[PDB]
Design a protein around this nucleic acid. Structure first.
Lengths: 257, 120, 204
RNA sequence: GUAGAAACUGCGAACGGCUCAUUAAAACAGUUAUAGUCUACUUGACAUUUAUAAGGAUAACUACGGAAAAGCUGUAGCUAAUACUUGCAUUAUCCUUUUGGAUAAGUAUUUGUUAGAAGGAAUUAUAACAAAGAAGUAACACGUAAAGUGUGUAUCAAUCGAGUUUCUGACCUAUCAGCUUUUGAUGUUAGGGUAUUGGCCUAACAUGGCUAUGACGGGUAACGGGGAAUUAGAGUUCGAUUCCGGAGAGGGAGCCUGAGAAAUAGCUACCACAUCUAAGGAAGGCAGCAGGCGCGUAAAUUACCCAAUUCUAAAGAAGAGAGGUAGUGACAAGAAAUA
């Protein structure tokens, strides 16, 4: 048969997973869920190789069995569950909240987040659909189908999502002052306010994004994540603060200690 | 014998109710030291009143002696040890004996047995 | 050369082993499922009527109702067929089988007595064996004992003590879960109503 | 209550592993579409035409056997289930204008007649009318806040993918110059079939389509790719083989099941091999792991373990010749005695 492959080779694992080459030849294939395998990572490596909480699959699973790991305040027991680009995960008894953000190099790193900001999660919508009764339901990048969205919300506008009530709070547009985050582009990891767009005739629309250091970089429209307006990032950024510090002048920063 | 104890990467894991830290023992001009002395040393360092709650492994004596690296772990209690530790580690630490040591012979005779050919 | 005479009413079967071929002529040419007077098989068997419903050939290949032939044949076996045990769900096997027509090749015969005769057979038409296990469904046992819905049948179960678990019961948890799902669907209706109500004001 | 042999039921077994025979615009690689489709588990939304709870139909088992036997098998009797099958309110809309009246009740899917948040273009979403119209909306199981969960179900979206598909790219050969077209070749119409487009196929219609820019043939001791050696740059040769994609399970062909196979440690028939045999009849595919024979210059142990990675399940305690460890191993590679 040629059915769905139920294995993932270690060498074929995505680069940001960072799997040792000698630690076997199989990678934990993420189960079907809210996000794609390439742009999401499993709790296994999240808590074994990134959090360093566990050292083995068996101990990862016996941590997982207890309802102490919560994503969006929802307990999860799928061992290879795709967390996604942007989400809120919580560990209860030790009372910590991790928001999955990017890194300037372009990896996945959990970021410490308080309860208040954890209650404030953002989802980029993908498309809106009209159903029976002339009602519009919009699907986010998290595979989340939220019905009854604001009429002012557009296809590329992002919407504030509340975790408990599962409701929309406020929409953010794609304006020249819209602070965005490149999701899967070659310039992944750099935050920017966008400088302009170019509406091309039926091809991948590109946008030129302006950095804090006046660096202009072009990336596709299909892989951006509006994270707030020009006032401030609505999401607590990681230590690197979303500024792609250059490779040549990274070594001078690294060498002083 | 007298030796120096170094603890690095000392962190606490509420998920396991444990603590993880890399353990180094400096014993220059002296060979490998028994785990009992370092067990007592770490117990009195961390005010531990019991011995069996600790797990020591990863001990590499390095070249020429004088420094042995290793990994040390602590548990909340014997209950935590039993719940979150596997049989081989338990046997090595010395609490319970191993299960029946047949191994793959279990699967061999499972294949030998056939469905609806044995009354039992 | 052996016959299992069974009484469905008495739930007991008895085996007779015979050699003489003259005793089998009345059952020759007779297909499975037909009734024959089994008088030549025994002096005390006179007046007994037997229905032939099973058998095997000399090598052990059994009969089959559909195949109206006198010899062993090969045909593809479907899953729901009466002479095929399943191996894989969908597996279809081709095996030899003997036809329904009875000849001088059967090593076994299965027959059931249908009409009682004049004599009595020791251990066949005198004693009987019960169900050996009572009904499990509450409706089944209720119909058996004719006590309708007056009371729970848990106090009138067969003991050997221990008692079987009764399905389709009237335990309070069933009603509790039914009311839970009813109130859940009502909550769903009211939350949908308030959702559409709050949507109906921001459309401007 | 704790369990629990056997069995029914559910899922997987379509993953993985091995090999490179076939393979020459084919596969593969980069680049597109599917506005021409399907999609297990999972997540997120959510639904229409006896009820203090309905019905049969069966295993294991009991008792008699057959043969030499199969992972073989008959009748009598029975019981269950989340196996199989029936079936129990209410909501929305219009009017005087919180509140009273009246109006109506099909989800997908198909047909006919209209209007018509997005995309790049809709016959799109969706809405209206007239006709049909499946499958469900729980007759099921455990128990968390100092109401919950499992299993199952209609539609939509993503997830894990798959099938088709635009464009660009291949070794030698003209002592291969004209090929294809009744037997579909090239396209039109109409229809069948598929999950969908399509000569995929059928009926009619037209004579078309490719080709020295090498078609059509033939050969390859040719699976393709990133990759390897040699490299100042150009280049030349190799790539079965760590991973991706394709193929195969002795050679063809066919089929059930299943979401997913033209599966092969699933079946069916022939061809070529080959097992037991009481002479009647049964049962087979090590290009899986070890190992033997044959071939050959040439290639390891009929070992141990699920401890590491990962997969399956009814998902902690069970499995996995996957995989790891060890044995042989002057394939190669690195450090380094004989002072």
């Amino acid at each position: 048969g040629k059915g769905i492959k139920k294995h993932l080779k270690r060498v074929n694992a995505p680069s940001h997973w960072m799997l040792n080459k000698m630690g076997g030849q199989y990678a934990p294939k993420t189960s079907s869920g809210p996000h794609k395998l390439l742009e999401s990572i499993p709790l296994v490596i999240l808590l074994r190789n990134r959090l360093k909480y566990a050292l083995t699959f068996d101990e990862v699973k016996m941590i997982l069995i207890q309802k102490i790991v919560k994503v969006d305040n929802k307990v999860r027991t799928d061992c290879t569950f795709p967390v996604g680009l942007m989400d809120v995960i919580h560990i209860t008894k030790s009372n910590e909240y991790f928001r999955l953000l990017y890194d300037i190099k372009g990896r996945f790193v959990p970021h410490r987040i308080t309860n208040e900001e954890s209650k404030y999660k953002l989802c980029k919508v993908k498309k809106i659909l009209l159903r029976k009764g002339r009602l519009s339901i919009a699907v986010t990048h998290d595979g989340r189908s939220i019905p009854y969205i604001h009429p002012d919300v557009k296809v590329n506008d992002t919407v504030r999502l509340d975790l408990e009530t599962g409701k929309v709070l406020e929409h953010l547009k794609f304006q020249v002052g819209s602070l965005v985050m490149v999701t899967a582009g070659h310039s992944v990891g750099r935050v920017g306010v966008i400088s302009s767009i170019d509406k091309n005739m039926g091809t991948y629309d590109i946008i030129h994004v302006k950095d804090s250091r006046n660096k202009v970089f072009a990336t596709r429209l299909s892989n951006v994540f509006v994270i707030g307006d020009n006032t401030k990032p609505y999401i607590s950024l990681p230590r690197e603060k979303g500024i792609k510090l250059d490779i040549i002048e990274e070594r001078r920063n690294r060498l002083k200690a | 014998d007298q030796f120096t104890i170094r603890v690095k990467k000392y962190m606490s894991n509420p998920l396991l109710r444990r603590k993880q830290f890399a353990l180094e023992i400096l014993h220059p001009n002296k060979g490998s030291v028994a785990k009992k002395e370092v067990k007592e040393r770490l117990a009195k360092m961390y005010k531990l009143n019991n011995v069996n709650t600790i797990v020591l492994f990863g001990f590499k004596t390095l070249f020429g002696g004088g420094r042995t690296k290793g990994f040390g772990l602590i548990y909340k209690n014997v209950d935590a040890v039993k719940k979150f530790e596997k049989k081989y580690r338990l046997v090595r630490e010395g609490l319970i004996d191993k299960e029946t040591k047949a191994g793959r012979r279990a699967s061999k005779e499972l294949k030998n047995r056939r469905k609806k050919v044995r009354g039992t | 050369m052996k016959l299992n005479i069974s009484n469905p009413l008495n739930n007991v079967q008895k085996s007779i082993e015979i050699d003489d071929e003259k005793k089998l002529l009345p059952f020759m040419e007779k297909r499975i499922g037909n009734a024959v007077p089994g008088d030549s098989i025994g002096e005390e068997f006179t007046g007994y009527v037997f229905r032939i419903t099973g058998g095997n050939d000399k090598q052990g290949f059994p009969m089959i109702q559909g195949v109206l032939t006198n010899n062993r044949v090969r045909l593809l076996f479907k899953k729901g067929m009466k002479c095929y045990r399943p191996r894989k769900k969908g597996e279809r096997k081709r095996k030899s089988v003997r036809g329904c027509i009875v000849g001088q090749d059967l090593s076994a015969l299965n027959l059931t007595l249908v009409k009682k005769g004049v004599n009595e057979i020791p251990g066949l038409t005198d004693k009987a064996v019960g169900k050996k296990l009572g009904p499990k469904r509450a409706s089944k046992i209720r119909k058996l004992f004719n006590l309708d819905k007056s009371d729970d049948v848990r106090k009138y179960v067969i003991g050997r003590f221990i008692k079987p678990k009764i399905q389709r019961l009237v335990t309070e948890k069933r009603l509790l879960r039914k009311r839970n799902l009813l109130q859940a669907k009502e909550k769903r209706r009211l939350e949908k109503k308030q959702q559409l109500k709050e949507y109906k004001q921001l459309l401007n």
